Symmetry: D2
Subunit: 351 residues, 4 copies
Amino acid sequence: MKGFAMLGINKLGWIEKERPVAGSYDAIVRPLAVSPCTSDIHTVFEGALGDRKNMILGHEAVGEVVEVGSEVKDFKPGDRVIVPCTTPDWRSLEVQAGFQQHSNGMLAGWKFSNFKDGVFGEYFHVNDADMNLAILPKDMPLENAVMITDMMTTGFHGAELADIQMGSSVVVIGIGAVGLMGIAGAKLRGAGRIIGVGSRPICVEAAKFYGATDILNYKNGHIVDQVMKLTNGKGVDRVIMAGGGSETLSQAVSMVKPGGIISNINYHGSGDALLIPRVEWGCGMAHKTIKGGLCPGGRLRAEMLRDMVVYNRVDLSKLVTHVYHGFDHIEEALLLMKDKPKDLIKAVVIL
Amino acid sequence: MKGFAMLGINKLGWIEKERPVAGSYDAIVRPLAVSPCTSDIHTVFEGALGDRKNMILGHEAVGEVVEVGSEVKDFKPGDRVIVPCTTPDWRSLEVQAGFQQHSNGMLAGWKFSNFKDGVFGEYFHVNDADMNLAILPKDMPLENAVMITDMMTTGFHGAELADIQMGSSVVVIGIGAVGLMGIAGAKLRGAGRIIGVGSRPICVEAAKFYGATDILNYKNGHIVDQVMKLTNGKGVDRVIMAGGGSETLSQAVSMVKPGGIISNINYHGSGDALLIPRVEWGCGMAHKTIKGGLCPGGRLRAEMLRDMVVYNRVDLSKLVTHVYHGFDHIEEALLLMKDKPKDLIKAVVIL
Amino acid sequence: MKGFAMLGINKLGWIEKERPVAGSYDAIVRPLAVSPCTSDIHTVFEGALGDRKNMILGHEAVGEVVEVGSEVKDFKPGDRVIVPCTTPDWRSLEVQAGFQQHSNGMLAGWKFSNFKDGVFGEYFHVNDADMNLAILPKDMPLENAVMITDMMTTGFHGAELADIQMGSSVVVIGIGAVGLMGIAGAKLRGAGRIIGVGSRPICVEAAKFYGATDILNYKNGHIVDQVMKLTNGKGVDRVIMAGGGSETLSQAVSMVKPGGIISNINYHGSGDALLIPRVEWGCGMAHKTIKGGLCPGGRLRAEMLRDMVVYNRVDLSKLVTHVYHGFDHIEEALLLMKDKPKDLIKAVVIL
Amino acid sequence: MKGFAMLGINKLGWIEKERPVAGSYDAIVRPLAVSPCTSDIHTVFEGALGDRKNMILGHEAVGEVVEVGSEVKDFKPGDRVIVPCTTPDWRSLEVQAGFQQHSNGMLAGWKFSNFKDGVFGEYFHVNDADMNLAILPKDMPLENAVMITDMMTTGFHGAELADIQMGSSVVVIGIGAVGLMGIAGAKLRGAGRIIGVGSRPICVEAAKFYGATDILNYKNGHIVDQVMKLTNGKGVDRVIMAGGGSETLSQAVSMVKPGGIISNINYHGSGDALLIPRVEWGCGMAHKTIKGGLCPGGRLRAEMLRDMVVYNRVDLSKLVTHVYHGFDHIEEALLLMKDKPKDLIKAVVIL
Ligand SMILES: [Zn+2]
Ligand SMILES: [Zn+2]
Ligand SMILES: [Zn+2]
Ligand SMILES: [Zn+2]
């Protein structure tokens, strides 16, 4: 079958890969709409996963079940489904410990464009269909549905890990797609003041739309000083790290109140060392908790998020700035993701 | 001073009570706007607190600081403040244990119309001003501010105790003021589906406004069966008990999924026994947690909720259906609260 | 094969049932040592599960893997294993929600002597061997190992649900096997004062051994008054309901401090209504949380508990008062469980 | 009055400071037994708190109430009390937020040898006696009681922050007094395997006594590799950082399982940057939570810990290796703390 893959480091191209076969509990899905991700860029142009040879890219997609294994009972061919980027192996000790995203290994829940071929192919494999798929509502716009697969689940996970309280002040560093969802999630957790950090005009408007009460731009001051000024030297209760370099951790620690929580959902892949400012971290006694983790996946997660969209708890349309029709547009969309033009948040390719 | 008080059981009337004096850490506040509560009715007409003799009623009010003790540093006379219904004694072992609402006794945080004269007087006493008051924003409508004092804090507390997850299905039993805030709080915690239970037209519209995706009326089926039908026999993740008789507990347990949480914010005062249906509760092994508690009070709580109002996280105006001007209207407003006419949610008396 | 089963309500007897076959992920185990349980009695003599026809009893056993399905990779025939009483279907939405004990239904984790034949047979079926079995340490006494299967996991679960703090005062109502483990678990959670409620001499000594600092007997006062007297009217932080009638709930609520937690691990099966004393529960505003749930099962749980035994964190030997050798003794052991002689805690039948 | 103070950086000596006066809610206490701390050394010889001029040292002591303010109701002169090292200002927004250790500032709960003169004086000041003191049991050995003030509360706090589960594997880095308490606390939280890291013979024996199942020495391998080998490449669930340089953070992250928790109770004061190994931290997506915080103080904390000692939940005697009689011995004891002889854990000076 045809599939857009990473030929080699810094080399992209369409290839003729084999068609995946479904195991007894698996499903073969044909993509209806997909979306390129920053991670795809990191994998190819930054060798985040080493020299992957001819591995199909993509992990964000909604599609149609084409084939189903003999044991799949809840999903059958023809079923339109939302595919969470994280598809864990539900039968593992990690799952029993309550950490699905790490079933059988650290970050093992993330299989697409890692352990196996991604969604940028005529067909892709989904392990344990009954446990990793969710039905796509008949009237849900494809572009929006694709946003659930990673953007929504990740951003919301940032807000969840942040353990936000009713009225908590929150700072979201990085207002890209994930950051915007972090803002949306923060608001949906009862956050009061939400300060989004970014400069891209399109992202700024989206940030405000999702709940940002204040917008800070690096271009006019050290972010911590700006936050401090806005909070009258008090600082903020929570900080969600969604974008930026490793230095953001230091900034997060510096702007969060002692006893606050810093939630990281930014997949760092460049500087090999995130640093905690000793003095600002109260020498490790300021009670400034630091959390960070891969977005939850699986059927339940997808269904719960889906239901939130169905009940209009969040409008994912604002994340989609570019929509292409026709499989061939994947390359252009991915390159767009690499070049990062000023008016881009997310791009969806509807087949 | 003049004050509307409970003369005796089932007897209401204005009296000439003494003017409260402020201790070193206390403040004497003059009400700007007050609101009658269902609890006031329960106290007077249902002897919920026994035969209280000439005790001034009310615990929902925003006012102006008239007098301040020598040790009060953050509040001075002239200051317009939001007074939380719960004003705990912050120096107690219960506070150290993390339960302010019970500082120095069960429900000891609730002093107005219980341990001391309420807010339905020319002046009222606030213990530990610096720890129990919050500045009322210059442009915040009085009617709305009063809703923060109890309705908002209680309803939101129900959603908080419910430990709602992103996408959780929630059933709110009782769509009166508190229930409406429970719905609003639920939505602000990321709830997906929110089923409100009630029939009063005005409350139903308010419920939908605050986030209710479905509305159920007792008049056409056993609530549990209706919930079951709506959820395809799956049940709901959370249940917030905001209104109704003791039987609602049984209904809550029956409709919540095993492992779910039932949050009670309904002050029961009639049937002296809430029953848990053994079979439905999985014989006490279904992991159906039951929580219940007085609304948090104090300065921080009031400020956090206030900030949420300032940041338009919730529109409290929909709770206020009746607004009177002039202290004398307290009686009429309280009686209105007793008669419960079809178009009443909350009534605010602006002095 | 031969198996001791419930012929009908109040009728016990050995029968010739068919031998269970192992599915691809299942295992057929031959019991090495088993233990009768109070639940077995409730099922037979109290029809707790209705009129079960010829269903083999028992759910507490350690054995040897005889047969293994083609997909079982971690367990092979000859392996000596600890079988948790709770063997969940790890591939379910409830598991994804974090509630294994209810995978595919309320209390669905408990299959033995419920959904299928128990362990009181020449062989018994274990679903998903790799996910529901644990290796029995070579030198671990069989009698002790059997205590892990239910007694330890349940009692400890009570302490876990109780969310005990370092120094918390805990009252354990019912000092039978489960209660004794509740006491042991409470101590292992850092509880300070532990008050055990019971009178049976043998259980009293065991209670003290496991950590009980005080022992209360109903025979000389209303338990709440006794607890109050001991705590100087202050009450206790936590209460674990391990035994007694439905009235214990009321007692638990009455003796626990507002903001405390009541953990129920007592499978109620008689009075069809547990009552919460309104006034003592602070009318549902005292922050007295009530939890209750089936013991966790599965491999991880069994392994973790096992490791605690291996590291001498708890001595399970004190639970075993009667040890029989020979399969035929199951009847006598079960009857002993029904008659409840003064010197009985738990009885183990080593085949 | 006489008091052992920090004359200047690296300069220790007895001085004639003024006697503290008690405010309305305060108490003046005379030390009965005190204990030098590593922090005292860091303050003096490492300028951890800058150039403190003539500030009396010490924050670990049990004493007798000499003077009591007019508002102190629970404590009167003659009362023997345990003084927690952390004495928060219970009337603050931080307390309302649930973080007493930071009342009115980061680490503001720690007043002795920071915001005011320490306990190494003829008399010392205790703010809010009723909220910050605990009665010393008549028969509790002074040396042991002093260990409660900081060592016990800190070590246990490490175990508490670690959110240990029944059977969790825990690694405690640094087996000094705090680390030993971390081990004891870990065991008291139901930890299964406890690996203590250290080499000092006296500390090693104490570690085993408190619950350490394994002891690792840096002298024979990279600690992570050793831990990995012991756990069969699986790693550990929790890691408590009690001692060592900033590099221990990296080691903790490297040895903890993804989804595990790292609890820091080591007051870092040397290298001004604790580093998180990007790759080992799963690039900030491994769910490896990092917590760290000052020991809880106040009356409730002290009483709960005290009760644990009373109920023999922990034997603090093993922490005390040196006991001196006579106030003058403070200097020798503090110097001993600086020189760190092989046979020293903690030293207590009984006046
Ligand atoms: Zn993605
Ligand atoms: Zn009210
Ligand atoms: Zn059993
Ligand atoms: Zn110290």
